[model samples]
Structures are given as structure tokens and as C-alpha cells.
Target: GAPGIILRYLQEQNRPYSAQDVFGNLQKEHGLGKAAVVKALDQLAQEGKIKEKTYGKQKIYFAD
Candidate 1:
């Protein structure tokens, strides 16, 4: 549910967002745990619903 919300927000904003950014926002605004957010993002990536790109040590996710 949180992943969907985050994805929708990204779509509505028309911008690329990092996993860290999304996770941080979820933790701060939605009170979701960081580990849970990260796990969901990983699942989304594995399911091929989103694209994950690595920039150095940072990872960014975009809806595919």
C-alpha cells in the first residue's frame, strides 16, 4: 500500500525519485519503518513494476 502511494506520488509529480528519498519521506510523513520501505522497494524492483538504477552507492527508482 505504501509502495503504491509512493509510486502514485512520483507519477503525479512527474519526477524521478530515489529509494532513499521515498523511504525517508515515508518514515517522516507516513511513519513507515525504513526497513519495511526498503523491502517493499526491493520487491517492486524484483517484480519488474519499477526500474532501479545505481548511481555510485545510491539507488534511484523509476516506474517502468
Candidate 2:
């Protein structure tokens, strides 16, 4: 729903973050769901709206 908004927030912060990072931040700051946040990140990645990096077993995202 607010993937673009969320992406903008992350890009503005200029940090690479994992799915859990985005999920927790959204849930804490905006009362959203972890699963939903993950879905949004996945969708954005699939759409080529963001770049993803794998660190160990974790996946982190950054603006492209």
C-alpha cells in the first residue's frame, strides 16, 4: 500500500536494511504488520523498484 512511501523513507535515511528492519520500524512507527511489510518489500523488489542484498541468511534492501 505504502511501498513507495516506505521506500522513500529508507532512501532518505540512506541505509540498507533487512526485511525485519523495515517490518519492525513500520510496526513501531506506524502500527503496521510485519508480514505486510515483508510483502511490500518483496513486491517492490520484484518490480525493480529497489535493490536487494543478501547478508548471511538475511536479505537487505536499498533504493535503486
Candidate 3:
């Protein structure tokens, strides 16, 4: 559910999201913690459901 929500958010915005960026938004909106956010993100990555890149020193996430 969180993964889908995360994916949907990224797709709706059509932009890259940093870990802290998404995590903070998710945390604020859904009250998820660091572990939960990272877990959801990792799940998406493991399932090949997300695109990732490097921006400066942060890892950016987006939809395919």
C-alpha cells in the first residue's frame, strides 16, 4: 500500500524524489518512519517498479 502510494505520488509529480524528501512527505502524510519508508522504497526497487538515479549526494527515485 505504501509502495503504491509512493509510486503514485512520484508519478503524479513526474519528478525525482530524494529519500529524505519522500520519507518526509510519507511520514507527514502517513506517519511512516525511516525504516518503513526505506523498506517501501527498497521493495519498489527490488520489484523493479521504480527508477533511480544520483543527484548530487542523494539518491533520487521516480516512476518508470
Candidate 4:
């Protein structure tokens, strides 16, 4: 459910976003928690619904 929300946002924006960036926006608008947002990103990346890349220790996600 939450992943769907995140996925739609990513697809619509068509830009890269860090988990922190996503959490920051979603927490306010969607009332989603940080852990929930992180899990949604992890799941979406695992499912190939989105893409993930790391720079040093930071990870960024973007939809296809």
C-alpha cells in the first residue's frame, strides 16, 4: 500500500530521491513513518519497481 504511494510519486516526479528525502516529504503529506518509507523503498527496489544506486553510504532511488 505504502509502496504504491511511493512508487507513484517517484514515477510522477521521474527523478532520484534518497530515503531521507522521500521520508521528509511523505511523512508530512502521507503521515508515513521513516521506517515505513525505508521499507517501502527497499521492497520496491527488490521488486524492480524502482532502481537504486549508492554513492559512498548514501542510496538514491528512481523509477523507470
Candidate 5:
């Protein structure tokens, strides 16, 4: 359920976002913690539901 919501969020946003950025916004909206947010992001990437990239000092994700 959480993962599905997160997927929708990414698709709707249609932009690259760092874990912390998504965590901050979703945490307020859905009350998820940083760990859940980070894990969800990694899972989505693994499933090929999203794209992940690392540049400079941060890892970011975007809908693919």
C-alpha cells in the first residue's frame, strides 16, 4: 500500500527527487519515516518502476 502510494507520487510529480526530499514531503502527507521512504524508493528502482541516479552528493529518483 505504501509502495503503491509512493509510486503514484513519483509518477504524478514527474520529476527527480532525493530520498530526503520525498521523505520530507511524504512524511508530512502520509506520516512515513525516512527508513520507509528510502526503502520504498530502492524497491521501486529494483522493480524498474522508477529510475535512480547518483550525482554529486545525492541519489535521486524519477518516474521512468
Candidate 6:
């Protein structure tokens, strides 16, 4: 479902999810690879539609 599933999962969480956490989930839970998840994340980052927070080594992708 392309970005729909990703968006939906984020909406369900409501809180920010670390890039490490989400990428892993997307791959394991949705059968999406690193490229697929990264591409979507890159797209969202380019579109400026999503916000990310940095927590030391991990970067969280989601809103407050």
C-alpha cells in the first residue's frame, strides 16, 4: 500500500518513533526492505510533511 500503511502506522502510534524502530518494524511487520522504507522516509522528508527528532544516535521520525 505504499505510503498509506506507513502513514497509518504512524497515526496509530501518535508518538514519535525512532527511525531505527520504524525501519525495522516496516521491514519485519510489512515485509518492506530498507530501501523501501528509506525511500518513503526520504520522500516524506523531501516533501517536508513529516518531522524528525534526534535522540543521540537515533533519529526519531514522527510528530509530537
Candidates' lDDT values, in order? 0.75, 0.81, 0.84, 0.91, 0.86, 0.70
Top lDDT prediction, candidate number: 4
Backbone clashes for every candidate come to: 0, 0, 0, 0, 0, 0
Ranking by lDDT: 4, 5, 3, 2, 1, 6
Clashing pairs in 3: none
Cα misplacement distance, residue 48 of candidate 2 (Å): 1.2
The total number of steric clashes, by the backbone 3 Å criterion, in model 2 comes to: 0
| Model 4: colliding residue pairs | none
lDDT of 2 by residue, 6-64 (tens): 68868898888888888878787777677777778888888988888889998899888
Please give the distance, in angstroms, between residue 30's alpha carbon in candidate 4 and its true position after superposition: 0.2
Q: Model 1 over residues 1-64: C-alpha lDDT tens digits?
A: 8777666666676666787888887677777677777777787778776778889988888777
Candidate 4 positional error at 56, Å: 1.5
> RMSD to the native, candidate 5?
1.0
Best-fitting candidate, scored by TM-score? 4
lDDT preference between candidates 1 and 2, better one: 2
Can you give the lDDT of residue 19 in candidate 2? 85
lDDT of 3 at 59: 79
Residue ranges of candidate 6 with Cα displaced over 4 Å: none
Candidate no. 1 TM-score: 0.78
lDDT of 3 by residue, 1-64 (tens): 7888888888898988888899998887888788777778888988998988888987788888
Poorly placed runs, candidate 3 (over 4 Å)? none
Model 6, 1-64: lDDT tens per residue? 5356666778788877776677788877888766677667656666775677678976777732
